[PDB]
Amino acid sequence: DDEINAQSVWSEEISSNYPLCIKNLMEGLKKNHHLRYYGRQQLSLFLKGIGLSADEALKFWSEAFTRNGNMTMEKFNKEFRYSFRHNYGLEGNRINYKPWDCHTILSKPRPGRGDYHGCPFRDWSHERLSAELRSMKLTQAQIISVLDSCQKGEYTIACTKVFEMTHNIAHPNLYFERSRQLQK
């Protein structure tokens, strides 16, 4: 828990390593104090994969869902705690919940209104992406190249370009591990 814990996953240092899909999910969670089912699975299994323990996950999710008075601790416990415990096997299930790879993510139903799951390289407008990429200090030529991949449907190539441009088998957890190792 020294490195990855319920508090450090909200740090700039740790979150700087998240790919765009995980950034989007974290932002939706931060703003709305909730995620719908598919996003609740994509993010929770990603965080399990980077080493967030069962206890730290329950802290993370309960604090995020109850933040800013969004719901009571009792409503979280009655309506969501089981679901997060289930993802960790804490009620004894033996289902093989592994983090979702990019192909799995892309194959989930496309996000509609109020959804944050999926792959932003596919799901965001080019204007939405460009603004997101300018905030990551990419220049126009860089953005044009990323968007060219997106228009071709090559979402994981777009994501790989973003990784290369922001640093000095496609899987969000690999992006994270690859990025985090470059901080060490």
Ligand code: SF4
């Ligand atoms: S290509 Fe994969 S890791 Fe990158 S944003 Fe899309 S789903 Fe996430």
